[PDB]
Design a protein around this ligand. Structure first.
Ligand SMILES: [Ca+2]
Ligand SMILES: [Ca+2]
Ligand SMILES: [Ca+2]
Length: 199
């Protein structure tokens, strides 16, 4: 019955398109080699003779949550088993994404201080800082009457500010979502605000 040289095998790599068709690791027992489980969307290939595990597809932190766990067999017909942990580091490869490019119209009454508009949320598929999102208003607020809370994405008129329909009747605000990855990724959406008469 064949003896695996290591009790478990392990490697740590950055996810990304540079991983396609690279040799990750070679397992050895003392004889033919297979991956029998943990091979997510056929990411991996084993050389049946040489025992080298190659990435057929891009290593992806978002599919693996940072670790692929492969069950490998060695057979001559007696069989023995091990595990191959392919540990993956997260890179900033997902843009913070709003589900719609435009939402509107959101009604707001003139003549009242600090009314709420609505909450916007961009999703980021990355983890850690790479997945954390900061919100801002980057256009369409020429008098500085609005704020979006930078973590919670709540758009409101500033506390001690009242709108006035005759001054400005409609706003189209560009909202920016920026992640805390290096380099950072961002996207924008458009918010349509209609200002209502105090009747
Ligand atoms: Ca990825
Ligand atoms: Ca990532
Ligand atoms: Ca990101």
């Amino acid at each position: 019955a064949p003896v695996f040289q290591q009790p478990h095998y392990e490697v740590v790599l950055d996810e990304g398109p540079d991983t396609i068709n690279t040799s990750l690791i070679t397992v050895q027992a003392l004889v033919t080699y297979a991956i029998v489980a943990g091979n997510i969307i056929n990411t991996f290939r084993i050389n049946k003779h040489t025992g080298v595990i190659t990435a057929a597809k891009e290593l992806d932190y978002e599919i693996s949550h940072g670790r692929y766990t492969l069950i490998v067999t060695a057979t001559d017909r007696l069989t023995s088993t091990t595990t191959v942990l392919v540990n993956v580091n997260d890179i900033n490869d997902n843009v913070p994404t709003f589900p719609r490019d435009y939402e509107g119209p959101f009604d707001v009454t003139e003549g009242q201080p600090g009314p709420r508009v609505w909450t916007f949320l961009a999703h980021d598929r990355d983890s850690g800082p790479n997945g954390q999102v900061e919100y801002s208003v980057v256009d369409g607020d020429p008098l500085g009457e609005f704020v979006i809370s930078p973590v919670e994405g709540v758009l409101r008129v500033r506390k001690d500010v009242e709108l006035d329909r005759e001054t400005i009747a409609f706003y189209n605000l560009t909202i920016c979502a920026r992640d805390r990855g290096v380099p950072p990724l961002s996207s924008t959406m458009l918010v349509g605000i209609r200002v209502l008469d105090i009747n």
